[PDB]
């Protein structure tokens, strides 16, 4: 179960910043000290307990980018499952970025045409708040007209930044496109939701704290998953100060955050506030071996 | 002696006598058993001051070969006891002024051997418990011993090392040419480096 993810972009696009924050556990202020990635940096990251991710943090500078599509084209773009192209909105060479993306799409269509393309419009915190979404539209349409040209009828894009929680949503949806047996996880989560009579049950990953699945797939915030992921990353970094690891968290006897297994974390919001804690904890412990 | 006479450079070291080739005045900065391979960069980065204590002293024959003898007797007047200054404060000030010139306080075995062949020698100075202090100080020029009692009559005996045939008169005059940073021509130095020396202070006054 080896998944080959490519992480490409232009110079200074922030690819290694995403790789460090999501997986290597770096803060937002600690990405300024990062150097320039030379050629391709490989990272073998173990997701859940069975998945292994071969993330290829590519260079992004002009010599490396010209080298990718001429000499190493038979190596970087073969047996590829997911491409993640990072577009910087601070770039003044947007047409060159679109041409680089077109060459990457052409190579992927030539070699491994079953892959999944994702685009992240990074550094979307320097732009003013009023012109963000429209800008995300204005590029994306063009990218769609590019993406449908070289095969690939579908292309999913995300307005991302390292100073908010959108990175977690983008990376969660990128990673979840590779997780096997998602239907079984959804069915078991629905069964547990019916059994415990819970308002919403969300299943994460323990290390990266990315969302894996949700019970639902009073109006609630549509961006609650990424906010909970950011809050849990902050709480893990806070609990590292006490020389220990986070295990459980009970809020108002209504919100239970529990270590479901050695690779997942469950976030259960129930309906009745009068349930004793031990019954919910026991039912959590019974389902610990079920999701394994 | 300031040098050891090697018989020949072609003969090897005798046992491990090279570790005994250390200055006597700076011998106390090194630890008892830590090797010298560690204190290399520490001399450059963080230079060490001259220690207060000295662990060497002349033997009995050296005091009867080349030395002389003087005598002091000091006791503060009634004017200084108008302020809160007793004989202990005078002794502390006198030891303070014996220092700042290069003096080193003598505590160890040789000083005790000299003291017996004439009770407790002191290194620090505590006015609360003890009430009578005796301590030696040593530079190459002269060796002081300061004794005190409850009577307040502080006694200082100084043994001056006599000069050997006027070494500062047997060396030729040597005036180099010094060019400083703001100068542009090599002028003449205004001091003879060889004939300037730390002079023996008149400690009585």
């Amino acid at each position: 179960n080896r998944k080959k993810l490519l992480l490409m972009g232009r110079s200074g696009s922030g690819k290694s910043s995403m790789r460090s924050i999501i997986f290597s556990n770096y803060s937002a202020f600690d990405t300024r000290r990062l150097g320039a990635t030379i050629d391709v940096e490989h990272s073998h990251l173990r997701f859940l307990g069975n998945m292994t991710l071969n993330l290829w943090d590519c260079g992004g500078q002009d010599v490396f980018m010209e080298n990718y599509f001429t000499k190493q084209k038979d190596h970087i773009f073969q047996m590829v499952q997911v491409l993640i192209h990072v577009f910087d909105v601070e770039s003044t060479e947007v047409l060159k970025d679109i041409e680089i993306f077109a060459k990457a799409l052409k190579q992927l269509r030539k070699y491994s045409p079953d892959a999944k393309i994702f685009v992240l419009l990074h550094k979307m915190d320097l732009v003013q708040l009023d012109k963000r979404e429209e800008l995300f539209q204005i590029m994306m349409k063009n990218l769609s007209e590019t993406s449908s040209e070289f095969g690939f009828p579908n292309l999913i894009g995300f307005p991302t930044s390292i100073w908010d929680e959108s990175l977690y949503k983008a990376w969660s949806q990128i990673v979840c496109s590779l997780i096997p047996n998602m239907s079984n996880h959804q069915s078991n989560l629905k069964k547990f939701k019916e059994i415990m009579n819970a308002l919403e049950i969300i299943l994460f990953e323990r290390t990266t704290f990315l969302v894996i699945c949700s019970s639902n797939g009073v109006l609630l915030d549509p961006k609650r998953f990424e906010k909970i992921s950011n809050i849990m990353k902050n709480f893990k970094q806070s609990c590292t100060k006490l020389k220990s690891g986070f295990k459980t968290l009970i809020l108002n006897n209504n919100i239970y955050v529990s270590e479901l297994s050695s690779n997942m974390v469950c976030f259960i919001v129930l309906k009745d506030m009068n349930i004793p804690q031990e019954l919910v904890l026991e039912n959590i412990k019974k389902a610990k071996e079920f999701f394994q | 002696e300031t040098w050891v006479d090697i018989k020949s450079p072609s003969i090897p070291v005798s046992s491990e006598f090279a570790n005994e080739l250390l200055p006597i005045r700076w011998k106390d900065v090194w630890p008892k058993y830590v090797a010298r391979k560690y204190s290399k960069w520490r001399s450059f980065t963080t230079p060490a001051e001259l220690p207060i204590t000295i662990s060497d002293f002349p033997s009995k024959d050296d005091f009867d070969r080349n030395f002389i003898f003087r005598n002091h007797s000091v006791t503060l007047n009634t004017d200084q006891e108008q302020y809160n200054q007793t004989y202990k404060d005078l002794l502390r000030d006198m030891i303070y002024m014996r220092l700042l010139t290069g003096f080193q306080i003598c505590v160890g075995r040789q000083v005790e051997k000299i003291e017996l062949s004439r009770t407790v020698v002191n290194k620090y100075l505590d006015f609360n418990q003890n009430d009578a202090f005796k301590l030696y100080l040593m530079i190459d020029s002269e060796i002081h011993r300061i004794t005190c009692s409850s009577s307040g009559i502080i006694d200082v005996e100084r043994y001056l090392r006599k000069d050997e045939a006027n070494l500062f008169d047997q060396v030729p005059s040597y005036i180099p040419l010094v060019k400083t940073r703001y100068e542009s021509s090599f002028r003449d130095a205004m001091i003879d480096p060889l004939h300037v020396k730390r002079e023996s202070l008149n400690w009585n006054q």
């Binding site: - | 106390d28 900065v29 980065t45 230079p47 002024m97 220092l99 505590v107 290194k123 620090y124």
Partner: protein
């Protein structure tokens, strides 16, 4: 960054008697002078904490001191070493930058 007289070192050592210290303990003298116990030795061992007695050879190293350099310019400065380096090239390219980096560190 502070001027202690030799007698000031003597007095500060006199106040540090029958008092136990440890590593990196910032002592204070006259509420302004700062110290740092960077090393306690006993029987050849660098102990973390130690007891200072009447016969403890306490030393006062200075981290801000005056230094004089005397460089000999001779006929040998332009000579070559066996590897292929001039001696003044070693002096101005390997000795002084290293000592300044160590002083800043």
């Amino acid at each position: 960054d502070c001027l202690l007289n030799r007698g000031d070192m003597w007095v500060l050592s006199s106040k540090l008697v029958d008092t136990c210290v440890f590593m990196d303990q910032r002592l204070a003298f006259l509420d302004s002078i700062r110290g740092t116990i960077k090393g306690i030795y006993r029987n050849g061992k660098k102990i973390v904490s130690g007891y200072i007695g009447e016969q403890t050879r306490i030393i006062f190293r200075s981290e801000s001191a005056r230094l004089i350099f005397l460089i000999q310019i001779t006929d040998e400065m332009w000579n070559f070493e066996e590897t292929g380096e001039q001696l003044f090239q070693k002096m101005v390219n390997s000795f002084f930058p290293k000592i300044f980096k160590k002083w800043k560190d």
